[PDB]
A paper describes a structure:
BRCC36 is the catalytic subunit responsible for the majority of K63-Ub specific DUB activity in the cytoplasm and in the nucleus as part of two distinct macromolecular assemblies characterized by the presence of either of the MPN− pseudo DUB proteins KIAA0157 or Abraxas. The Abraxas complex (ARISC) functions in DNA repair and breast cancer suppression, while the BRCC36 isopeptidase complex (BRISC) promotes interferon dependent responses by deubiquitinating and stabilizing the type I interferon receptor, IFNAR1. BRCC36 consists of a functional metalloprotease JAMM/MPN+ domain followed by a predicted coiled coil region implicated in protein-protein interactions. KIAA0157 and Abraxas are required for the catalytic function of BRCC36 in both complexes, and enable association of two additional shared subunits (BRCC45 and MERIT40) to each holoenzyme.
Optimization of the CfKIAA0157 construct boundaries by deletion of poorly conserved C-terminal residues 290 to 471 (CfKIAA0157ΔC) yielded crystals in complex with full length CfBRCC36 (residues 1-253) that diffracted to 2.55 Å resolution. Following manual rebuilding and refinement, two highly interdigitated CfBRCC36–KIAA0157ΔC heterodimers were apparent in the asymmetric unit, arranged in the suspected super dimer configuration. CfBRCC36 and CfKIAA0157ΔC protomers heterodimerized through a large buried surface area (SA) of 8112 Å2. The MPN domains of each associated in a pseudo two-fold manner centered on helices α1, resulting in a unified β-sheet and “fused” MPN+–MPN− superstructure (buried SA = 2902 Å2). Non-canonical helices α4 and α5 of CfBRCC36 interacted with helices α4 and α5 of CfKIAA0157 in the form of a coiled coil helical bundle (CCHB). Consistent with our observation of robust catalytic function in vitro, the active site residues in BRCC36 when complexed to KIAA0157 resided in an active-like conformation shared by AMSH-LP, CSN5 and RPN11. Productive features included the coordination of a high occupancy Zn2+ ion by the triad of His94, His96 and Asp107 side chains, the position of the transition state stabilizing Ser104 side chain, and water-coordinating catalytic Glu30 side chain. The active-like orientation of these key residues was supported by productive conformations of underlying secondary structure elements including strand β4 (denoted as the H-strand for positioning His94 and His96), helix α3 (denoted as the D-helix for positioning Asp107), the β4-α3 loop (denoted as the S-loop for positioning Ser104), and the α1- β2 loop (denoted E-loop for positioning Glu30). Consistent with this prediction, the projected active site region of CfKIAA0157 showed no evidence of a bound Zn2+ ion. We attribute this to the substitution of the two essential Zn2+ coordinating residues (His94 and His96 in CfBRCC36) with Cys101 and Arg103 in CfKIAA0157.
Author numbering:
A (entry chain A): 3 to 250
B (entry chain B): 3 to 43, 53 to 129, 132 to 185, 188 to 199, 203 to 216, 221 to 272
C (entry chain D): 5 to 42, 54 to 74, 78 to 185, 188 to 196, 201 to 214, 221 to 271
D (entry chain C): 6 to 54, 56 to 60, 65 to 149, 151 to 250
């Protein structure tokens, strides 16, 4: 009772986290996991993408204010979905690095367990390819902190027949967060007396905004539309099959 | 041959991985996208971008008792999306093996010949993916690789570039070079419809318009997902039904 | 902290004056200081330099009256001074250099001048090895700290690869006398289209300065000769008088 | 190949060229006259360049300029040597420096190579070092005696050579911008124009504008010194 025996991560939540991790190969991304904790099983059905201003190598820290906003969001999910929802865990990415938790990760996870005991830690290792084989590898590690060491937690990615409305909205928040980060930087240099600097700053801002649109926003638009179109392709295919199979 | 690079976005790749981890057992489907050519300083580069994927039960395309593609069944399923098909993928569970089998190569040639006759047969793609797990299932591993059939009759791996904020394929300077012009885009159609094609403010307005459109597609995605999911349920129940009736007759 | 910035153009001119000099050379540093919020860091940008004979500023006591008559109205933009020693390779500060830095920092310090704490002393040398095929040029910027001790300041040569404005890629606004360039910007009465008009107007103005520079150089060189030759004449005459 | 005499104004152009960039080696050619073992360097050509640490058309423009100097200055002006910079790198000629120099000596004997090592600041001391190495190749790098000859002014050609750097950088940007002018993708079009915009303002802020200020203030500071000499000359004449 009350011990983390197994973690059941919904496929749609898995897609969001992976999409978040694949957004950049230079820095580590982070976010929080939401769901319900039953008889030793942490069922994850929601996810919050977080903003990380820090660009330090191993320093992946979720603020106190972010935890409060997430819990508040988890409170709203309960009223909406009519189901127990709560911050169950946290995730972050490992670009060009092994999926194994660092010393700081284990220590950070340990502090979380003083608060929730059954708190879950997920790590997504991305951007690791072979120079000759051209093969890519992506790892997903579910862990906790024991006696100062990292320990595996049994993970099963539970099938979903669709991508949740909340999961769809969550990955639409990514570009919005990124754009907001850029708006804050151009804010500190808003009214420059130097004309050359003003032209420079606008050119820098323009390139940065387009970059987010070209890499993040545009592909998500295409992915959503293609999904809609390709489902109709499959739907009509299944409809024609349903008639021929209904006989014998 | 020529220098080949396969590119893909995080969204499209995540959707592929998402679609794979859902499936009960193994899974295959087609790769949709576009090929582009670039001149460089004195050779030509080939950029094949995967825009989307679609799954398909292999048995829906086979004659019966043979692993031979029914070209009619294949045409009826793909419909008018044949011009977008740039390859196919194969996903396998509970294995770290990432080597092409005889059946995969056979399907590759058939899929190439069919679709190449209507891209070129040199760079029809085969995406081989797998998913394995550790002893305690605490660590999940996902491997994948892109391949093509060389003119010399060899299956060789192709470099894959996942376009992200850190690095993308357009950076060979900071300028984005214009590809070799060719005849015959959901995102640009949105821009053209909003007269945003005709640039700091433009960059912001296009982003905002994309966000608004993105927020409008969400309920349509859910509607289409549920529609197919129910159809996938009915058809599968009929398949198991006739498979047991045919089993009893044997 | 405190940062000294300079362009390759201005720095090359300082080196030009140093090398073409007959013996050791002395002069002043012209520029402007700006403050940036980030803590409060200060960038002192040296824009130009001017050479001046030390023997024409003395009554080791500096003549402040004769000093004013030299710099004239350009006293408001003096941010420091420089000393060039041809021989030797040491870059240490001697007693005279400290005494000269003190008087200069005191004279130019005021409401319209520059802050006395941020007055600069530039040491420059130019040694040469045996056979004289390898020439060595070393330089450093110094300031008088609160403790009473002089300390080396970081120098940043603003170039294409990197500059002091990149501390991000955005140009941060500083905390609030138009030059010849700003007046050119305003003359055009103005994204990409603006940029192209600047480089075009700047190039034409740049080529128009070339004949103006040559006539100023020839004038000051002719006068520098006449003064030098005349002082030599009076020296020989008074040595026999 | 006995000694090399470099004019200060030419020395300024070469150093100014080396102080233009920090992440790349900059290059150019030397032009002057060769007498009794000594090379009187009097001119300089700023060349445009290969991102790696390594042409015909460039030698053509240089030889053409050297011929034009012979008809305007009435002196045997020809390509005497070459110069290149070493940013964050010792002034000592590398294995390719001796190699390229060796092939040049075959075409023209007594061919001189100059190296400007720049951008080397000592940590916790804030001292900068700039070396000027005059070298040739025989078998290894050999040191040739160098003297920087005083100039009463900056040459009309040297001032124009300084202005050529700003023109070259801009031209190099136009050639890249023209290579992808009409892009069917609107996002790429906005991108490329933003890249071009930032680049032009970059060249102006770093090279063009300071060069204008350097020239403008030099005229202002010359006349300041000139007036000072006039007051002295007036008193000396009376004495
Ligand atoms: Zn980590
Ligand atoms: Zn070299």
């Amino acid at each position: 009772d009350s011990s983390l025996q197994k973690v059941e991560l919904q496929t749609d939540v898995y897609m969001v986290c992976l999409q978040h991790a694949l957004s950049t190969e230079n820095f580590e991304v982070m976010g929080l996991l939401i769901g319900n904790f039953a008889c030793g099983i942490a069922k994850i059905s929601a996810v919050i993408i977080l903003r990380r201003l820090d660009k330090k190598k191993d320093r992946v820290e979720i603020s106190s204010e972010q935890l409060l906003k997430a819990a508040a969001e988890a409170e709203r999910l309960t009223v909406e979905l009519n189901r127990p929802m709560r911050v169950l865990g946290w995730y972050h990415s490992h670009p060009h690095i092994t999926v194994c938790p660092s010393h700081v990760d284990v220590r950070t996870q340990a502090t979380y367990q003083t608060m929730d005991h059954s708190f879950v830690g997920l790590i997504f290792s991305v951007f690791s390819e072979g120079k000759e084989s051209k093969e890519h590898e992506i790892f997903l590690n579910c862990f906790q902190s024991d006696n100062g060491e990292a320990t595996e937690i049994p993970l099963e990615i539970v099938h979903t027949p669709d991508i949740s409305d909340r999961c769809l909205r969550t990955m639409t928040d990514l570009s919005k967060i990124l754009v907001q980060e850029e708006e804050d930087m151009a804010e500190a240099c808003k009214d420059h007396p130097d004309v050359l600097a003003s032209i420079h700053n606008n050119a820098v801002r323009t390139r940065a905004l387009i970059h987010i649109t070209d890499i993040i926003t545009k592909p998500l638009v295409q992915t959503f539309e293609k999904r809609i179109a390709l489902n109709k392709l499959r739907a009509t295919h299944l409809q024609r099959q349903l008639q021929e199979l209904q006989k014998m | 041959d020529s220098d080949l690079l396969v590119t893909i976005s995080g969204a499209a790749l995540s959707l592929l991985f998402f679609e794979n981890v859902r499936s009960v057992g193994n899974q295959m489907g087609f790769l949709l996208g576009e090929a582009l050519e670039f001149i460089v300083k004195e050779t030509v580069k080939i950029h094949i971008n995967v825009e989307a994927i679609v799954t398909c039960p292999l048995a829906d395309l086979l004659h019966d008792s043979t692993n031979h593609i029914n070209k009619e069944k294949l045409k009826d399923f793909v419909r008018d999306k044949s011009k977008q098909v740039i390859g196919w993928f194969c996903f396998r569970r509970n294995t770290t093996n990432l080597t092409l089998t005889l059946k995969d190569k056979l399907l590759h040639k058939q899929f190439a010949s069919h679709f190449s006759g209507v891209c070129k047969e040199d760079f029809f793609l085969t995406c081989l993916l797998n998913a394995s797990t550790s002893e305690t299932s605490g660590t999940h591993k996902f491997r994948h690789v892109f391949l093509r059939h060389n003119k010399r009759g060899m299956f060789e791996p192709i470099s894959l570039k996942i376009n992200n904020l850190g690095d993308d394929a357009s950076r060979h300077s900071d300028y984005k070079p214009t590809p070799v012009r060719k005849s015959t885009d959901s995102f640009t159609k949105l821009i053209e419809s909003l007269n945003l094609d005709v640039g700091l403010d433009s960059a912001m307005l296009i982003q905002k318009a994309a966000e608004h459109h993105l927020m409008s597609l969400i309920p349509k995605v859910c509607e289409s997902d549920l529609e197919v999911a129910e159809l996938e349920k009915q058809v599968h129940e009929l398949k198991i039904k006739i498979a047991t009736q045919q089993l009893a007759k044997r």
